[PDB]
Write an enzyme that holds these catalytic residues in place. Structure first.
Site, PDB file in Angstrom:
ATOM      1  N   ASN A   1      38.440  43.154  46.520  1.00 51.83           N
ATOM      2  CA  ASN A   1      38.187  42.245  45.410  1.00 51.83           C
ATOM      3  C   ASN A   1      38.799  42.802  44.139  1.00 51.83           C
ATOM      4  O   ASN A   1      38.738  44.011  43.896  1.00 51.83           O
ATOM      5  CB  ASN A   1      36.691  42.075  45.226  1.00 51.83           C
ATOM      6  CG  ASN A   1      36.346  40.979  44.275  1.00 51.83           C
ATOM      7  OD1 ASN A   1      35.809  41.225  43.197  1.00 51.83           O
ATOM      8  ND2 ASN A   1      36.616  39.742  44.677  1.00 51.83           N
ATOM      9  N   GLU A   2      39.437  41.928  43.365  1.00 50.39           N
ATOM     10  CA  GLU A   2      39.873  42.221  41.987  1.00 50.39           C
ATOM     11  C   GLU A   2      40.476  43.613  41.763  1.00 50.39           C
ATOM     12  O   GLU A   2      40.099  44.302  40.817  1.00 50.39           O
ATOM     13  CB  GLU A   2      38.731  41.965  40.977  1.00 50.39           C
ATOM     14  CG  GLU A   2      38.147  40.548  41.013  1.00 50.39           C
ATOM     15  CD  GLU A   2      37.171  40.242  39.874  1.00 50.39           C
ATOM     16  OE1 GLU A   2      36.385  41.125  39.483  1.00 50.39           O
ATOM     17  OE2 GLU A   2      37.185  39.101  39.366  1.00 50.39           O
TER      18      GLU A   2
ATOM     19  N   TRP B   1      30.999  31.257  42.021  1.00 51.82           N
ATOM     20  CA  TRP B   1      30.563  32.636  41.866  1.00 51.82           C
ATOM     21  C   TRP B   1      29.136  32.859  41.404  1.00 51.82           C
ATOM     22  O   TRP B   1      28.872  33.619  40.451  1.00 51.82           O
ATOM     23  CB  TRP B   1      31.511  33.543  41.092  1.00 51.82           C
ATOM     24  CG  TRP B   1      31.005  34.977  41.145  1.00 51.82           C
ATOM     25  CD1 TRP B   1      30.556  35.743  40.100  1.00 51.82           C
ATOM     26  CD2 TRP B   1      30.817  35.772  42.322  1.00 51.82           C
ATOM     27  NE1 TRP B   1      30.141  36.979  40.553  1.00 51.82           N
ATOM     28  CE2 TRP B   1      30.294  37.018  41.914  1.00 51.82           C
ATOM     29  CE3 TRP B   1      31.064  35.563  43.684  1.00 51.82           C
ATOM     30  CZ2 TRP B   1      30.025  38.042  42.817  1.00 51.82           C
ATOM     31  CZ3 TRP B   1      30.789  36.584  44.578  1.00 51.82           C
ATOM     32  CH2 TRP B   1      30.277  37.800  44.144  1.00 51.82           C
TER      33      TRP B   1
ATOM     34  N   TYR C   1      35.542  33.537  29.839  1.00 53.91           N
ATOM     35  CA  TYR C   1      36.180  34.571  29.032  1.00 53.91           C
ATOM     36  C   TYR C   1      37.189  33.969  28.061  1.00 53.91           C
ATOM     37  O   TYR C   1      36.959  33.936  26.852  1.00 53.91           O
ATOM     38  CB  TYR C   1      36.862  35.607  29.929  1.00 53.91           C
ATOM     39  CG  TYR C   1      35.907  36.378  30.811  1.00 53.91           C
ATOM     40  CD1 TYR C   1      34.835  37.072  30.265  1.00 53.91           C
ATOM     41  CD2 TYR C   1      36.075  36.411  32.189  1.00 53.91           C
ATOM     42  CE1 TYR C   1      33.957  37.778  31.067  1.00 53.91           C
ATOM     43  CE2 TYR C   1      35.204  37.114  32.998  1.00 53.91           C
ATOM     44  CZ  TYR C   1      34.148  37.795  32.433  1.00 53.91           C
ATOM     45  OH  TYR C   1      33.277  38.497  33.234  1.00 53.91           O
TER      46      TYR C   1
ATOM     47  N   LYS D   1      25.248  34.397  36.903  1.00 57.86           N
ATOM     48  CA  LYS D   1      26.236  33.400  37.288  1.00 57.86           C
ATOM     49  C   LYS D   1      25.822  32.651  38.560  1.00 57.86           C
ATOM     50  O   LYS D   1      26.530  31.737  39.015  1.00 57.86           O
ATOM     51  CB  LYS D   1      27.601  34.070  37.500  1.00 57.86           C
ATOM     52  CG  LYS D   1      28.558  33.957  36.327  1.00 57.86           C
ATOM     53  CD  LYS D   1      29.755  34.856  36.534  1.00 57.86           C
ATOM     54  CE  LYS D   1      30.401  35.260  35.221  1.00 57.86           C
ATOM     55  NZ  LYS D   1      29.757  36.458  34.662  1.00 57.86           N
TER      56      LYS D   1
ATOM     57  N   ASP E   1      30.698  45.075  39.387  1.00 56.90           N
ATOM     58  CA  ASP E   1      29.619  44.302  38.790  1.00 56.90           C
ATOM     59  C   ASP E   1      28.283  44.801  39.258  1.00 56.90           C
ATOM     60  O   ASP E   1      27.538  45.431  38.497  1.00 56.90           O
ATOM     61  CB  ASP E   1      29.761  42.854  39.245  1.00 56.90           C
ATOM     62  CG  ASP E   1      29.219  41.874  38.232  1.00 56.90           C
ATOM     63  OD1 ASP E   1      28.480  42.293  37.313  1.00 56.90           O
ATOM     64  OD2 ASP E   1      29.545  40.672  38.347  1.00 56.90           O
TER      65      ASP E   1
ATOM     66  N   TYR F   1      38.011  32.718  35.486  1.00 56.85           N
ATOM     67  CA  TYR F   1      36.852  32.473  34.637  1.00 56.85           C
ATOM     68  C   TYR F   1      37.271  32.215  33.193  1.00 56.85           C
ATOM     69  O   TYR F   1      36.779  32.862  32.268  1.00 56.85           O
ATOM     70  CB  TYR F   1      35.885  33.657  34.700  1.00 56.85           C
ATOM     71  CG  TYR F   1      35.263  33.868  36.062  1.00 56.85           C
ATOM     72  CD1 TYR F   1      34.098  33.206  36.425  1.00 56.85           C
ATOM     73  CD2 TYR F   1      35.840  34.730  36.985  1.00 56.85           C
ATOM     74  CE1 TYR F   1      33.525  33.395  37.668  1.00 56.85           C
ATOM     75  CE2 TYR F   1      35.276  34.926  38.230  1.00 56.85           C
ATOM     76  CZ  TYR F   1      34.118  34.256  38.568  1.00 56.85           C
ATOM     77  OH  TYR F   1      33.552  34.449  39.807  1.00 56.85           O
TER      78      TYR F   1
ATOM     79  N   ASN G   1      39.979  34.101  41.436  1.00 58.25           N
ATOM     80  CA  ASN G   1      38.662  33.979  40.822  1.00 58.25           C
ATOM     81  C   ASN G   1      38.745  33.830  39.307  1.00 58.25           C
ATOM     82  O   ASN G   1      38.325  34.714  38.562  1.00 58.25           O
ATOM     83  CB  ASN G   1      37.789  35.183  41.185  1.00 58.25           C
ATOM     84  CG  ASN G   1      38.178  35.806  42.511  1.00 58.25           C
ATOM     85  OD1 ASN G   1      38.620  35.116  43.429  1.00 58.25           O
ATOM     86  ND2 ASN G   1      38.016  37.120  42.618  1.00 58.25           N
TER      87      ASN G   1
ATOM     88  N   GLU H   1      36.319  33.027  43.628  1.00 58.46           N
ATOM     89  CA  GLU H   1      35.175  32.884  42.736  1.00 58.46           C
ATOM     90  C   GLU H   1      35.496  32.182  41.418  1.00 58.46           C
ATOM     91  O   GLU H   1      36.651  31.985  41.075  1.00 58.46           O
ATOM     92  CB  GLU H   1      34.467  34.217  42.533  1.00 58.46           C
ATOM     93  CG  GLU H   1      35.303  35.246  41.899  1.00 58.46           C
ATOM     94  CD  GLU H   1      34.620  36.618  41.870  1.00 58.46           C
ATOM     95  OE1 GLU H   1      34.177  37.062  40.778  1.00 58.46           O
ATOM     96  OE2 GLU H   1      34.566  37.278  42.915  1.00 58.46           O
TER      97      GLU H   1
END
Lengths: 588, 584
Positions: free
Chosen positions: B405-406, B542, B465, B561, B164, B461, B459, B497
């Site tokens: 992360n992710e 987040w 999304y 965000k 990001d 969303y 996390n 998040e």
């Protein structure tokens, strides 16, 4: 409503002979639940008419609704009406409109942007009162002419309207409703084709009367008030000595007074219909209005304001037009649907050039093959053509309207696209041989990849390199764009117009650095595009996308609608406005 | 290859090198070796900062590759007989220290320290030219990964990456010259246990040479020493200890001195510790043997002009904003933050999830292979764990390590890649549980990494999304996933998040994304669902604040965000949060 044809009358007006009444106001309003049109209405819910309902109520259920809604109000036929034939008209229904007189279905109409009406004269009596209820369905399908599909949400089961366009799916009675009268023997249609012999201005006309009673007179008056030619017969041509031509910055309009004299020297019907006199030719790479070459400047626009959404607004129209003059815009394009009729007449008086577009937007799936027996088939093409007819029937007369736009951003690079589109520009040139024909081409459908363009007269390109392809890489984008311009200018000997170019901008977001969504970035992209156009001699115009921020379907990359506006949704100039004003007013 | 954070004592000295350095970026001149001459630039770049946004110049901001910071340094006359070195709190990714043209260090972590003993390179009392080369280029092997590419037509270099936030480069954290005695302390280690009312701690100091003896005092907050010990390491009890608690910071100071043959102190170090234990039992996260719930945020090292550059004021204010809104925790999003923040968190009673710089191990092509992320990448990933844990092991505020992360924890190769990593962590520091933040695609079905980790960090969303603007629908897809995880694993779940973008000032009474209102509604409905799941261990929204990102048509001048704005002003959600977090 018949296949291969168009049954609207002329735009209702008031005369010595016809009478006009507005049905606009608040109406009782409710949502599809059963058969509500057979009794009165049970709601404290009132919705203004000229308006789209979705935003009006501050209600989620209403905004989100999928299906039919019901407008209702009582009407009284004036007792003065008998011996006059009278009827009820909707300038537009959201998408799918139905008219009930007292609880008999009297009209059913599938276009979402064109008028429809019902002759109610044998159905109610002069002096009588009935219950007008009008039903508007906002549902899109693969066959409806902006295409879409209703789906259902696995968990909650909620109904949800998919579609492929940007702008929000505003539903309802967006345009004025009327109850008017016409004499038993009346003028129903008029066709005007303006041409020029040397300095002599000749207009071929054609008048359609309900019956064969009396004869047809036509006076043709100038702006001062003095008739300058006359004629008899349902048709002929009229000669105008030393014509004042309708010009793209200098509107002249004569007033064609069609009258239906009876056996004796007496007028029994009459109708005032303004025309201006102008030719439109494409020669090769060049766009000629009155035999002098022309370059578009302006925007694709939307019918979209704050609470009424799509509902036509007198004062925003006038304000919008003043902003165009303020910045020296000469044209705009009716973006992805035909706008209110009154905007076209205004455009005529205003001397603004119009690209008139059908409501065929999102004919693609790549925003799955879009041209097949599933998505866009022959029943869809049928509706597409059905819409071409009603548009032309309605708009054929406006000297401001200057070219037809068949579709926005159709999937014209795909197998199937050519078969689909083939009859459509051909229909347009046939119904109206005076104007050229186009559609606005998508970025994917490159000069190489597009298999439709040759069937059209003008090439209209929507591009967004400095946005999509070369994200913030203005130089790498200047490369891409001239790559593409070359391709088209080499492959084809038509003139080109950028119908769409732009970049989302949030008012007040500034940056000394290159940053998208910043007033500054918008300027820079716009500016480098211009620089490129000027180096191509094949360009015939430029339309920024868009005039003003507008509401779209909910989406993560959509900051409460589309911000590619040069003005805010409340019509305030971003930096781009001033760039465009500087370019459009200071050179030719 | 590090050492304890330099500090001034009675036997150690310490100079800051922060300020304006002559700054220049690498071109393709004849001058291919800029580190052995004066720089041609008339640009001064501030040090504690990071350079991209500083100069209002595109070529600088856009630059891919090396830049050079340069300045003159005077080693003090009194430093002789003493041992001195030059430390970098951090670089951008790749830093090289040059001391009078001489390559003296070369370091590949992006957010940890590196240093160089230069006692024999420069004479005490003399001046030298220090120049530091920082390279911003990521590769399939750098720890945030990414490739550099060439724009076809123009030829311009460009840096791709998967994460990001924007790839701010430079000397984002302070630079030091410091003194240390010939026979100095190099590392210390502290492990705090609670044994009823009594706090115990096991100290482990590592000095340079072994002569004299090691001595340790432990002083309370009031100045009075409270336990003593002798030996390079041993274990201390503290009668009726004052516990470091997430609400109420308490920090004993540990003085470790290096006594000599006589009764004199040759060297000494002050090291703050809080006494506190972390146990995960079942689905529960216990801090000092009582259930705990993370409230707070993932954050970012991101402010306005200095970019990623450490900032004392925004630090203090940020925490004051956690206190204002009743937050108790946060996550060092996608890189360890500056050392002093962790210290500050200690003093502040704020709990920390310490994350490595490993984001964007995800190409949504196959991400775990001999092309994208291979063993070599995994080498570098283990190195960051080493350096992260080595630096931060001591902080009572740090309560969990976060491996990445992710990452694509759902693709093949993911498992072989991660396997060694949490083992490594638990080996380096037994006192804390280990985790990584799980991506959306890696569902409780799809994920193949999670069992190998102590706590589950997710996390989601959806409302953003998935059920975009359909909160009722998102609620369902949310609880569906939480059943899944709590049904499948016997561990604590923390929403690492979650939340939606929002433009300050943008308002609406209906369901419209990007409006302040929509954010409150999403955050809220999530809390409703969290309160129904007994397996939940904490919520971190987040984002603390808006932060700059890689340029994108979907990113409005960065990520929005954030619960506050980039200049730290409360959005609607800030107040929603403050209400929930202070009151129950």
């Amino acid at each position: 409503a018949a296949q291969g044809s168009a049954g609207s009358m002329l735009k209702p007006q008031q005369t010595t002979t016809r009478d006009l009444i507005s049905l606009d106001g608040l109406w009782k309003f409710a949502l599809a639940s059963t058969q509500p049109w057979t009794s009165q209405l049970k709601t404290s819910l009132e919705c203004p008419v000229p308006a789209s309902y979705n935003d009006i109520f501050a209600d989620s259920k209403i905004h989100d609704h999928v299906g039919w809604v019901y407008y209702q109000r009582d009407v009284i036929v004036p007792k003065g009406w008998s011996e006059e034939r009278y009827l009820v008209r909707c300038e537009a229904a959201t998408h799918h409109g139905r008219i009930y007189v007292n609880g008999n279905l009297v009209a059913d109409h599938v276009g979402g942007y064109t008028p429809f009406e019902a002759d109610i004269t044998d159905l109610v009596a002069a002096g009588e009162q009935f219950r007008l209820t009008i039903a508007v369905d906002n549902e899109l399908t693969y066959q409806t002419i902006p295409p879409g599909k209703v789906e259902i949400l696995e968990a909650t089961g909620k109904k949800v309207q998919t579609y492929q366009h940007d702008f929000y799916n505003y539903a309802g009675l967006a345009r004025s409703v009327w109850l008017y009268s016409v004499p038993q023997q009346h003028i129903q249609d008029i066709t005007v084709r303006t041409d020029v012999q040397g300095t002599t201005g000749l207009i071929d006309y054609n008048v359609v009367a309900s019956t064969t009673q009396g004869t047809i007179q036509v006076a043709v008056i100038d702006e001062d008030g003095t008739t300058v030619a006359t004629s008899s017969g349902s048709n002929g041509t009229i000669h105008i000595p030393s014509v004042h031509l309708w010009q793209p910055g200098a509107a002249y309009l004569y007033q064609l007074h069609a009258s239906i004299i009876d056996s004796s020297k007496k007028t029994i019907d009459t109708y005032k219909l303004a025309t201006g006199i102008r030719t439109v030719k494409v020669q090769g790479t060049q766009f000629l209005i009155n035999d002098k070459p022309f370059y578009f400047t302006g925007f694709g626009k939307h019918e979209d304001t704050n609470i009424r959404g799509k509902g036509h607004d007198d004062a925003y129209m006038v304000h919008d037009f003043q902003l165009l003059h303020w910045m020296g815009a000469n044209s705009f394009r009716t973006s992805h649907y035909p706008y209110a009729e009154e905007v076209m007449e205004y455009a005529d008086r205003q001397g603004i050039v119009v690209i008139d577009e059908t409501p065929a937007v999102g004919l693609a799936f790549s925003i799955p093959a879009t041209f097949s027996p599933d998505r866009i088939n022959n029943k869809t093409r049928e509706a597409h053509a059905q819409a071409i007819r009603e548009l032309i029937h309605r708009d054929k007369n406006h000297p401001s309207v200057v070219m037809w736009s068949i579709a926005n951003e159709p999937a014209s690079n795909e197998d199937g696209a050519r078969e689909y589109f083939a009859p459509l520009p051909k229909l347009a040139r046939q119904l109206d041989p005076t104007r050229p024909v186009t559609f606005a081409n998508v970025g994917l459908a490159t000069y190489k990849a597009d298999r439709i363009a040759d069937l059209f007269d003008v090439l209209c390109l929507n591009r967004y390199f400095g946005w999509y392809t070369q994200t913030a890489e203005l130089d790498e984008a200047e490369a891409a764009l001239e790559e593409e311009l070359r391709g088209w200018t080499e492959k084809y000997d038509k003139p080109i117009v950028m119908t769409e170019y732009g970049a989302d901008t949030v008012a007040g977001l500034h940056s000394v650095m290159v940053t998208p969504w910043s007033e500054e970035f918008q300027v820079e992209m716009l500016d480098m595009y211009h620089r490129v156009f000027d180096r191509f001699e094949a360009m015939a115009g430029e339309q920024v996308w868009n005039f003003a921020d507008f509401q779209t379907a909910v989406g993560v990359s959509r900051v409460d609608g589309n911000k590619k506006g040069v003005f805010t949704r409340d019509r305030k100039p971003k930096a781009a406005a001033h760039l465009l004003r500087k370019r459009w007013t200071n050179l030719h």
